[PDB]
Ligand binder design. Sequence first.
Ligand SMILES: C[C@H]1O[C@@H](n2cnc3c(N)ncnc32)[C@H](O)[C@@H]1O
Ligand SMILES: *C(=O)CCCC[C@@H](S)CC
Ligand code: MET
Ligand code: SF4
Lengths: 121, 299
Amino acid sequence: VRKFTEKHEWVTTENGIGTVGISNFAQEALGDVVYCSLPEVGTKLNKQDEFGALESVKAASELYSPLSGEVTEINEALAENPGLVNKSCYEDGWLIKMTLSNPSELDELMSEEAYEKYIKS
Amino acid sequence: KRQKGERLRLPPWLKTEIPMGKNYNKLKNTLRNLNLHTVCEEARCPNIGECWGGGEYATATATIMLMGDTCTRGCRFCSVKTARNPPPLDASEPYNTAKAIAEWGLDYVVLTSVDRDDMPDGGAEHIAKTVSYLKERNPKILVECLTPDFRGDLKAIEKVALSGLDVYAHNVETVPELQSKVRDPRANFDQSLRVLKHAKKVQPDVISKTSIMLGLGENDEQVYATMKALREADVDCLTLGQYMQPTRRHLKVEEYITPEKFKYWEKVGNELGFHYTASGPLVRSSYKAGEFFLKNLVA
Ligand SMILES: C[C@H]1O[C@@H](n2cnc3c(N)ncnc32)[C@H](O)[C@@H]1O
Ligand SMILES: *C(=O)CCCC[C@@H](S)CC
Ligand code: MET
Ligand code: SF4
């Protein structure tokens, strides 16, 4: 169960924890990622709040929150291997993990098959 | 210090958006159906969103890359794939290219290609054929060709300059001092200059054009000497843009040139006598080439 945002961010939930990353379409557009600006653990985010940024060799994009919640963990493997988000955007290349202050916000995100039509139409 | 020791952070004036929209997917669908490639995609150009699309309500264009997506050369700045034995030429690509441009309705079209040093004529006939199919379907259409150097083969250059094109483009890329560090060693400044000079003598009515990348370690004295040598070779148009690292395994940016400094280099091009000088950080050889041509050469 993977939902998407209009800014090409995905989220998956398990045990009340949302794992946030960027889609495969976005990382392909961005290229080889070099630096990931991630928020400190404990940051309280609102939906669509700008919580970070990604810098690639030939591109840069901002990261916007798909949910309202509190940041619980950041992917520490991105400091030594930032290329994980390019070739593991849905698994090892995740960015942050957060709580869900308002789980009903998941209905505002599009499904995985609605997002493929979103980028192809 | 600034590269090969550290990394320079991307300045804000180089950030672009993820390509998106209906025009962008229309162009993509056409290219995949016809088995065509673009330099925009393979060189990972940051302007794809702007050139290919818009808001869905604009004039979409893209620079088709002929002769496959795999080059025989390994330029240290170029993210186009490299292989010693590229696949053979698709003879229908010159014909399918004219179909894609007829579909897009372009009045101005830019064509380019990978280098095919494995080909006896460097693929010049394959390029010239695409131009002929375009002019056959639309004689008034304006076509610009960003061609390889053909390793200085004068017969290969002639074949392209006789195809009927309007603009003959070939990029010098960098200053003469950095040719061996930046380009594939099969290219050099004197050879690139010989290409642009010869196309004029093959067809004196075509417009010659070349591009330079800044930020690879050159200094201003070398840049002005390069621009000065280009006017003495009778090159009409000039493009200057910021070099940007396309892949972590390609060259690091030595310096990020400010926007004001590109505006200065536009003035130098006007002082030297270029018919137009497209200058700016995100400017590339094909970037808004139609606008620059029509606003400056038909004016
Ligand atoms: C196709 C044209 O686009 C330019 N080009 C190709 N790759 C890059 C890059 N990383 N950065 C800047 N310009 C590039 C070259 O000038 C080339 O000739
Ligand atoms: C990265 O800067 C690649 C630039 C490619 C320029 C193409 S799209 C036009 C010639
Ligand atoms: C896409 S690279 C530019 C055109 C040609 N392949 C050259 O380097 O001369
Ligand atoms: S000749 Fe050089 S710049 Fe042109 S496509 Fe091949 S590698 Fe890229």
